[PDB]
C-alpha cells in the first residue's frame, strides 16, 4: 500500500474533460434559454431555506442553483460578474458563452490545438467590439423622453412591463436624484443612497419614489409631535444616556451624601447634554443609539421629536436628504450641521406599523421608493426590475452611446466581421467565422421564444441584413417579425452590449484553455 | 391495480403525520362518540351513591376521588371534543364550585340525542337552533322552580342543614359531622359587612385518628416550630416582620473598612450592642412573640431568648399575609419596634404535638378573626385529601349561597320538572326544530336515571314514577336512595336542595359545549411533537 498521491485524489485528462467542460456550459445555457426576450417565461425557484424566488433574469436564477462541476461554477461566476458590473445582459452573456463553447467544440474535435482557437477568439472579440462601437447612435442626456424610451426598452422584457410607463419614470427620477458632485467627483451611488423598500399589500401603481427618506420607526414618546411643517433635522451618532465608560472606576462611598449625589450628578449630566442639544433650537432629533427616559423628557420640554435607534445606512440617507450632518458629541454641534431642507415629517400608520417620512426636500441627494404591491415575492421581483432599470439609466448617464437591440447589433457585427474574414488568408479564419455565426444565437433565441419558424425567418433576416444601411434591422419578438428597431424604438446602452461580448469571449477562452482536472484533497 | 393513490388535492399536499376529517360521518359522529364515552367514564361517580375512583397520574401519584373535575384533570384526555367538554366542566367548577358531573352527563346526553336527530334526518343547524331555543326556554322557566330560600346565612343549624346536601354527594357515610364543622368554620368567618371570601378558610391535614377528631379553630395553624427557647405565651402581642430578623445590610456591596487596631477590637462589640438595643426596643413595647419572614440571626435569637420572646419563622409570603390578616398586624420592612396601631393581638400561641408533627398555633378565643382553620384527622393522606376536597366544595356552595340563594329541589326533581315543561312547550311549536326541543327532555332524563343506576335500582321505573307524580302536580318529588326499591320522596321535607345559580350555570355551560361541538364540520390535526 504505497501511494504517491492521496487516496482521495482523482485525475482526469484528455479530450474527455474538454468535452465535459463544454457540456457543462451548455447545460446552464439550456436552463435559462427560455427566459430571454419580451416573451420570456417566469421561472420559480425553491430556496433551500424554505423561500420562493420567482424571476426571469439570469443572475437571480443561477444564484439559487448548486452545481458540482467546476465549469458550471465558472458560468455562475460570469453571471454574477455581468450582474455586478453593468446590471443587465446576464442571460445574454450566459447564452453567448455557452454557444461559443459549443461551436468551439467542433474545432476541438478536429485535432486542432486550442491555442489557435483562443487567438482567433481574441481577434474576433477585438473586431466585434470595434464594429459595435462603430454603429453607436449618440443619446441626449437632457431629453427626458429619450431616457424614458431607453428605460422602457430595457424593462419591457420583464414582469413590470405592464406598469412600464409608471415604473420607468420612477427609475429615472431616482437616477436623476442620487446624482451628486463633490470635490470634482460624480457618484450616482444607487447602492447606498437609493433605497427601495417593499411593503406587502396594496396596489402596484400606488408605489412611488419620494422626495426624501421613509423609514420604519416611530416617535419614542406618545406626546411628541407626529406632524412637522419645516423641521430642523439634527442627527446623532452617540447615545443620550449615562454609560459606564472604559477605565475601571470602583467609586468608594463613606459619607452619607455621596450616593444621592452620584445619582444627581448622572441626572445633571443628562440634563446638560439635553440643554446643549436644545441650544441650537432644532425640531426633530435622530440618533443611532438609545434615548434615556429623562433625556426624552427634556427633549419634550423643548417640543422636540426624537427617534430612537436607527441603522447607520438610514441615518446616512437622512443626512443626505436633509443636508444635515451626523454628529457624536452634542457639545460640538454647530449651526451648519442642523438640517434645513426637509419640508415635512409624517408619522403615518401603514397596516399595523408606524412609518416615518421626511419627504419633500429642497434638493435631496438620496431617495426612497415606497414600493407597494400584493406579496413579498411580487415586490421582490419588482425590486429586481427596478434595480435593472436604475443600472441601465446609470449606464446611459455615464456613457452617452446606444446600440440597436432586438438582435440587430448581433447580426450587424456578425456580418461586418464575416466580411472582414472573407479577405484574410490563413487557418484562423474558421474559428473567426465560427464566432461570427455564434453571435446569431440571440435572434434565434428570440424567434424561438416568440414561437416562429426560426429557419426561414432567420435566413430572411440575414439576407435583409446583407443590404447596406440595414444594420438596425432586427426581429420583433412581440410578434416575431422582421422590423426596423428605429421604428420600434428599442436601443440598449453600448456599455451592456460591449461588456456582454467581452466577458462572454473571455470566459469561453478560460473554459477552452483547460484540459486537466484534479479532484479531492485538502 | 394493487394500490389506490391519494386524491389530487388536499389529500396529496397534506403533511405526513397530519390527519384531516371532514363530513357528517368522518368528523362529527366521531366527536359525538368520543364525548359520549368521556361522559360515561365519569357517569359512574354521580350522586351520593357514586363510587370512588383511583387514578395514577403521569407522575405515579395516587388520587382517590369521586370529584368529576379532579378525575378529568388527573387523567390526560387526547380527543379534542372531549377536551372542549372538560374545559366547559372546569369553567363550571371555577365559576360555581359544584356541578361538574352534571355538565359531563348533560353534555353527553345532548350529544347522543343530537346524533340520533342527525340520523333521523334533521340538519345540524336545525338541531343547533332547537337546542338554543329550548335552552332559552329552560333558563326562563328555571326561576319558577325555587323553594325555601335561606334568608338567614348566620344560624348555625340552618347553614349546617343547607351545606349537608352539598357535602352528602361525596362523603355519604359521614354527612352531619362535616356539615356542622364547615358551618361553624364559615359562620365564624362570615363578616358583618362586605363579601364572603373562600381563600380565608384554611385546612390543615395531619396524620392521626379517625375523621371524628377533626376540629375547627378561630385562628391558623402552621407546621413550623419555634426557633427560640420559650414555647407558650398568653395574651400574645405579635409583631410581624417582612425582613429577616437581623441587622439590615446595604443592598449595595459594602465591606467593613478597618484602619486601626481599636476599630477592629470594637467593631464586634458595637454590632452586638446595636443588636441588643434593637431587640430591647422591640421587647419594651410588649412584644411577647415575634414572627419574621426570613432568616433568624444567632445574636438575634440569643437576645430574643434573653428578653422572653417567642421567635417564629415563616417561609412563604402568603403565610405571612394570612398571619397578618388573622392577628390584625401588618408586616414592615424595618426593625423599628411597632407603634400601638400596627401591632397584632392574639390570645395565645401554643407549640403543640398532635400527630408527631410539631405545630405552632395562633388560636383566638372569642370566635373572631378574618381567617379560620380546619384541622383534619385521618389514617390516610389520600382520604384526608378527599375530605379536603369535600370541604372545599361545601365552602364553595356556601359562597354561592351568599349570592342569589333561591334554593331549588334536587335529587332528580328539577331535571324531571324541566323535562316535562320542555316537552309541553315543544308540543306547541309547529316548525322543524320542535324535535330538537323535545330532546332536552331526554337530556334531563340522564340526570335522575344515573342517580337510579348508581343506587342499584331500576331506572325506567323511577323515571315513570317521577313523571306520574309530576303530572299529578307535585313538583318537589325525586329519587329516594335508601328505599332499595324504585320509590319517590318529597324533596322539600328532606331538606336536600341545590343552589339555583349552580344549576343555571351548569345548564348554560353544558348547552354551550354541546352547541360548540356540534358546530364543528372539519378537523385538521397536526402531528404531535
Amino acid at each position: 500500500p504505497v501511494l504517491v498521491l492521496s487516496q482521495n485524489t482523482k485525475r482526469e485528462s484528455g479530450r474527455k474533460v474538454q468535452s465535459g467542460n463544454i457540456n457543462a456550459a451548455k447545460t446552464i445555457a439550456d436552463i435559462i434559454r427560455t427566459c430571454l426576450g419580451p416573451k420570456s417565461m417566469m421561472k420559480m425557484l425553491l430556496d433551500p431555506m424554505g423561500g420562493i424566488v420567482m424571476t426571469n433574469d439570469g443572475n437571480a436564477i443561477l444564484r439559487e442553483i448548486q452545481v458540482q462541476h467546476p465549469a458550471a461554477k465558472s458560468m455562475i461566476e460570469i453571471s454574477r460578474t455581468q450582474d455586478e458590473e453593468v446590471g443587465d445582459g446576464t442571460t445574454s452573456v450566459i447564452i453567448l458563452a455557452g454557444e461559443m463553447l459549443s461551436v468551439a467544440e467542433h474545432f476541438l474535435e478536429q485535432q486542432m490545438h486550442p491555442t489557435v482557437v483562443i487567438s482567433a477568439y481574441r481577434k474576433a472579440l477585438d473586431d466585434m467590439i470595434s464594429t459595435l462601437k462603430k454603429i453607436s447612435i449618440p443619446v441626449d442626456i437632457s431629453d427626458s423622453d429619450m431616457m424614458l424610451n431607453i428605460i422602457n426598452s430595457s424593462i419591457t422584457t420583464k414582469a413590470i412591463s405592464r406598469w412600464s410607463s409608471l415604473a420607468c419614470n420612477i427609475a429615472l427620477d431616482a437616477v436623476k436624484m442620487v446624482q451628486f458632485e463633490e470635490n470634482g467627483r460624480k457618484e450616482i451611488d444607487i447602492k447606498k443612497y437609493a433605497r427601495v423598500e417593499k411593503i406587502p399589500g396594496g396596489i402596484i401603481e400606488d408605489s412611488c419614489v419620494l422626495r426624501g427618506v421613509m423609514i420604519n420607526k416611530d416617535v419614542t414618546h406618545p406626546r411628541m409631535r407626529r406632524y412637522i411643517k419645516n423641521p430642523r433635522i439634527v442627527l446623532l451618532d452617540s447615545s443620550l444616556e449615562y454609560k459606564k465608560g472604559e477605565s475601571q472606576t470602583d467609586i468608594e462611598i463613606t459619607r452619607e451624601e455621596d450616593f444621592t449625589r452620584i445619582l444627581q450628578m448622572e441626572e445633571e449630566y443628562i440634563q446638560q447634554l439635553c440643554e446643549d442639544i436644545i441650544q441650537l433650537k432644532p425640531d426633530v432629533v435622530i440618533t443611532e443609539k438609545g434615548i434615556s427616559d429623562l433625556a426624552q423628557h427634556y427633549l419634550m420640554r423643548a417640543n422636540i421629536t426624537a427617534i430612537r435607534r436607527v441603522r447607520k445606512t438610514d441615518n446616512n440617507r437622512i443626512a443626505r436628504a436633509c443636508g444635515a450632518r451626523i454628529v457624536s458629541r452634542p457639545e460640538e454641534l454647530r449651526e451648519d450641521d442642523v438640517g434645513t431642507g426637509a419640508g415635512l415629517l409624517e408619522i403615518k400608520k401603514i397596516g399595523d406599523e408606524y412609518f416615518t417620512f421626511i419627504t419633500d426636500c429642497k434638493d435631496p441627494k438620496a431617495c426612497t421608493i415606497l414600493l407597494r404591491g400584493a406579496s413579498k415575492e411580487i415586490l421582490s421581483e419588482v425590486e429586481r426590475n427596478l434595480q435593472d432599470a436604475m443600472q441601465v439609466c446609470r449606464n446611459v448617464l455615464l456613457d452617452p452611446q446606444l446600440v440597436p437591440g432586438g438582435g440587430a447589433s448581433e447580426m450587424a457585427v456578425a456580418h461586418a466581421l464575416t466580411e472582414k474574414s472573407k479577405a484574410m488568408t490563413g487557418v484562423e479564419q474558421w474559428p473567426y467565422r465560427a464566432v461570427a455565426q455564434a453571435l446569431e444565437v440571440i435572434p434565434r433565441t428570440l424567434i424561438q421564444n416568440c414561437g416562429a419558424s426560426t429557419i426561414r425567418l432567420l435566413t430572411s433576416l440575414r439576407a435583409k441584413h446583407t443590404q447596406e444601411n440595414c444594420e438596425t434591422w432586427g426581429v420583433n419578438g412581440e410578434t416575431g417579425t422582421l422590423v426596423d428597431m428605429k421604428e420600434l424604438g428599442i436601443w440598449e446602452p453600448l456599455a451592456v452590449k460591449l461588456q456582454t461580448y467581452k466577458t462572454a469571449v473571455e470566459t469561453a477562452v478560460l473554459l477552452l484553455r483547460i484540459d486537466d482536472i484534479v479532484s479531492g484533497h485538502k | 391495480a394493487l394500490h389506490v393513490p391519494k386524491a389530487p388535492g388536499f389529500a396529496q399536499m397534506l403533511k405526513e403525520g397530519a390527519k384531516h376529517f371532514s363530513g357528517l360521518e368522518e368528523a362529527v359522529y366521531r366527536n359525538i362518540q368520543a364525548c359520549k364515552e368521556l361522559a360515561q367514564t365519569t357517569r359512574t361517580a354521580y350522586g351520593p351513591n357514586g363510587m370512588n375512583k383511583m387514578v395514577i397520574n403521569h407522575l405515579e401519584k395516587l388520587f382517590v376521588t369521586n370529584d368529576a373535575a379532579t378525575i378529568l384533570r388527573e387523567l390526560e384526555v387526547q380527543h379534542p371534543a372531549a377536551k372542549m367538554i372538560v374545559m366547559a366542566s372546569h369553567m363550571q367548577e371555577q365559576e360555581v364550585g359544584d356541578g361538574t358531573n352534571f355538565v359531563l352527563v348533560f353534555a353527553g346526553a345532548l350529544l347522543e340525542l343530537a346524533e340520533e336527530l342527525l340520523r333521523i334526518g334533521l340538519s345540524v343547524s336545525e338541531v343547533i337552533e332547537g337546542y338554543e331555543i329550548a335552552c332559552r326556554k329552560a333558563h326562563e322557566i328555571l326561576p319558577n322552580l325555587v323553594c325555601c330560600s335561606a334568608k338567614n346565612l348566620r344560624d348555625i343549624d340552618e347553614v349546617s342543614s343547607l351545606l349537608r346536601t352539598s357535602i352528602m354527594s361525596k362523603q355519604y357515610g359521614n354527612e352531619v359531622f362535616l356539615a356542622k364543622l364547615i358551618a361553624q368554620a364559615c359562620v365564624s368567618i362570615f363578616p358583618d359587612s362586605g363579601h364572603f371570601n373562600v381563600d380565608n378558610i384554611r385546612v390543615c391535614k395531619i396524620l392521626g385518628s379517625g375523621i371524628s377528631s377533626s376540629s375547627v379553630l378561630h385562628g391558623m395553624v402552621f407546621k413550623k416550630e419555634t426557633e427560640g427557647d420559650v414555647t407558650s405565651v398568653k395574651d400574645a402581642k405579635i409583631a410581624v416582620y417582612s425582613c429577616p430578623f437581623d441587622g439590615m445590610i446595604t443592598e449595595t456591596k459594602g465591606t467593613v473598612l478597618i484602619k486601626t487596631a481599636e476599630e477592629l477590637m470594637n467593631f464586634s462589640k458595637g454590632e452586638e450592642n446595636l443588636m441588643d438595643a434593637q431587640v430591647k426596643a422591640i421587647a419594651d413595647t410588649g412584644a411577647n412573640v415575634v414572627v419574621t419572614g426570613g432568616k433568624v440571626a444567632d445574636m438575634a435569637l440569643h437576645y430574643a431568648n434573653k428578653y422572653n420572646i417567642m421567635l417564629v419563622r415563616l417561609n412563604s409570603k402568603w403565610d405571612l399575609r394570612r398571619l397578618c390578616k388573622t392577628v390584625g398586624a401588618t408586616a414592615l420592612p424595618r426593625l423599628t419596634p411597632p407603634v400601638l396601631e400596627e401591632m397584632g393581638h392574639c390570645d395565645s400561641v401554643y407549640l403543640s404535638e398532635v400527630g408527631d408533627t410539631q405545630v405552632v398555633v395562633f388560636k383566638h378565643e372569642k370566635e373572631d378573626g378574618a381567617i379560620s382553620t380546619i384541622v383534619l384527622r385521618g389514617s390516610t393522606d389520600n382520604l384526608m385529601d378527599d375530605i379536603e376536597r369535600a370541604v372545599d366544595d361545601g365552602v364553595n356552595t356556601f359562597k354561592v349561597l351568599t349570592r342569589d340563594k333561591r334554593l331549588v329541589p334536587g335529587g332528580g326533581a328539577t331535571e324531571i320538572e324541566l323535562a316535562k315543561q320542555i316537552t309541553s312547550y315543544g308540543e306547541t311549536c309547529p316548525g322543524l326544530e320542535q324535535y330538537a326541543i323535545k330532546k332536552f327532555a331526554e337530556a334531563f332524563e340522564a340526570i335522575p336515571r344515573a342517580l337510579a343506576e348508581n343506587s342499584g335500582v331500576k331506572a325506567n321505573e323511577v323515571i315513570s314514577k317521577l313523571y306520574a307524580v309530576h303530572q299529578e302536580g307535585n313538583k318537589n318529588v325525586g329519587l329516594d336512595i335508601e328505599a332499595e326499591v324504585p320509590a319517590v320522596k318529597d324533596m322539600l321535607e328532606a331538606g336536600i336542595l341545590d343552589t339555583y345559580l349552580g344549576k343555571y350555570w351548569a345548564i348554560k355551560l353544558a348547552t354551550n359545549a354541546a352547541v360548540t361541538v356540534l358546530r364543528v364540520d372539519q378537523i385538521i390535526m397536526a402531528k404531535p411533537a
Partner: protein
C-alpha cells in the same frame, strides 16, 4: 496597571471628559499641519471620524 478610584463624587465627571478629550487634542495637532488625508493601521471610533468629517479630511482605518 493604572486604574482610577473616585472618593468624592464631584471629581468623577471631569475625568470622563478627559477620557475623550485627550484623543480630541491629538486630532487637532494632526489637523494643525494642514493634513487632509489620514491613514492608520489601528481602528478609528465614531468620534474621531466626526472630527475628521467636520474638519474636512478623510480617515482610512
Amino acid at each position: 496597571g493604572v486604574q482610577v478610584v473616585i472618593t468624592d463624587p464631584e471629581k468623577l465627571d471631569q475625568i470622563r471628559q478627559r477620557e475623550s478629550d485627550i484623543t480630541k487634542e491629538r486630532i487637532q495637532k494632526i489637523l494643525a499641519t494642514g493634513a487632509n488625508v489620514i491613514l492608520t493601521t489601528g481602528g478609528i471610533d465614531d468620534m474621531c471620524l466626526k472630527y475628521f468629517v467636520e474638519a474636512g479630511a478623510m480617515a482610512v482605518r
